[PDB]
């Protein structure tokens, strides 16, 4: 299907200009949400009641209200081992870094 789902995406820490201070990892799978949001929609799974109402209001007025959009429903963190200038090896956990599941909101 071409519906709202999680897509794999690898991001190199070079994009953020962290490389010169990171030990590991040199990158990670950030992934991203993407896909069309339309019926079928489940308020207890990959959607909210509002998304159901909006999708409906959209079908009868595409020129005004847009379809809900594919966004993350579950995000994981990633730990990074890096050093500062005093040579301190540090371990920092970054939350909401990885997309695990997507849904319509």
| DSSP result, 46-59 | TB-HHHHHHHHHHH
Residues that bind its own copies (CB under 8 A): 9, 11, 15-16, 30, 32-34, 43, 48-50, 53-54, 56-57, 60, 65-66, 68-72, 75, 94-99, 105
Of 60 and 87, the one with the shorter C-beta distance to its own copies is 60
Of 57 and 90, the one with the shorter C-beta distance to its own copies is 57
Smallest distance, its own copies to C-beta of residue 86, A: 22
CA 9 to chain centre: 10
Smallest distance, its own copies to C-beta of residue 74, A: 11
CA distance 31 to 45: 20
CA distance 13 to 104: 29
Smallest distance, its own copies to C-beta of residue 25, A: 13
Smallest distance, its own copies to C-beta of residue 10, A: 10
Residue 34, beta-bridge partner list: 5
Helix (H) or strand (E) segment spanning residue 83? strand 70-83
């Amino acid at each position: 299907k071409t519906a709202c789902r999680k897509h794999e995406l690898y991001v190199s820490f070079q994009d953020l200009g962290w490389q010169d201070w990171i030990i590991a990892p040199k990158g990670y799978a950030a992934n991203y949400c993407d896909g069309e949001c339309s019926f079928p929609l489940n308020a207890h799974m990959n959607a909210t009641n509002h998304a159901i109402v909006q999708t409906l209001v959209h079908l009868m007025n595409p020129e005004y209200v847009p379809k809900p959009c594919c966004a993350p429903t579950k995000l994981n963190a990633i730990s990074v081992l890096y050093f500062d200038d005093n040579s301190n090896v540090i371990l920092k956990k970054y939350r909401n870094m990885v997309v695990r599941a997507c849904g319509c909101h």
